[PDB]
Amino acid sequence: MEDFVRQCFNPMIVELAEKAMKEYGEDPKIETNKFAAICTHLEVCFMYSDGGSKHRFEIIEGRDRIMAWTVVNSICNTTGVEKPKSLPDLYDYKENRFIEIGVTRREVHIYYLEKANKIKSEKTHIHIFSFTGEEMATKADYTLDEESRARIKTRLFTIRQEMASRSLWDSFRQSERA
Ligand SMILES: Cc1cn([C@H]2C[C@H](O)[C@@H](COP(=O)(O)O)O2)c(=O)[nH]c1=O
Ligand SMILES: [Mn+2]
Ligand SMILES: [Mn+2]
């Protein structure tokens, strides 16, 4: 699986993923499924950001903590939006709302509920994707056009197929915990 991650994700994504895990005291070489998951989430966040017009989104995920908060605080101060308790994934300039992106190895509804439970003060939009083409978003408001969403779902399905081709999917699929 380590070889797979290094092989299928671009080096910027891999470096960020390794940094995040090390920050929690985890070794990418050992907790490989987690490593793959972090990379997948990052890729989706980047793809989602590229979906709209130029300038539509601000990427929060993948930034160091100080910078991420600086962006969030700056957005809140200027637009007047309420400040989130935890860092969200992106900011949508057009709809003027923060977005939390979730990618799950389980089922979209359960993950959406788990995400919803964490936000509580839910002014943040939630969008969840699975590796099997399903998606779930707050109020069925999907934000992006179908073509954009299709591109993400396809990339995710492809990752699943590749993992499966290497006999890595069964373990990966079962590594997500409530
Ligand atoms: C906030 C956080 C996320 N993650 C992982 C879970 C996901 O695979 C990825 C993205 O998380 P997020 O969906 O909350 O943005 O980062 C952790 O391992 N520990 C953490 O504390
Ligand atoms: Mn995040
Ligand atoms: Mn997320």
From Swiss-Prot:
Residues that, per the record, bind Mn(2+) 2: 61, 89
Cellular compartments annotated: Host cytoplasm; Host nucleus
Binding positions (Mn(2+) 1): 41, 61, 89, 100-101
Modified how: Phosphorylated on serines and threonines by host kinases, including human casein kinase II.
Record: active site: 115
Motif range (Nuclear localization signal 1 (NLS1)): 105-120
Segment forming the signal sequence: none
Reported effect, residue 36 to V: Reduced affinity for Baloxavir and Baloxavir marboxil
Protein purpose: Plays an essential role in viral RNA transcription and replication by forming the heterotrimeric polymerase complex together with PB1 and PB2 subunits. The complex transcribes viral mRNAs by using a unique mechanism called cap-snatching. It consists in the hijacking and cleavage of host capped pre-mRNAs. These short capped RNAs are then used as primers for viral mRNAs. The PB2 subunit is responsible for the binding of the 5' cap of cellular pre-mRNAs which are subsequently cleaved after 10-13 nucleotides by the PA subunit that carries the endonuclease activity.
Subunit structure: Influenza RNA polymerase is composed of three subunits: PB1, PB2 and PA. Interacts (via C-terminus) with PB1 (via N-terminus).
Protein family membership: Belongs to the influenza viruses PA family.
Descriptive protein name: Polymerase acidic protein
Native source organism of the sequence: Influenza A virus (strain swl A/California/04/2009 H1N1)
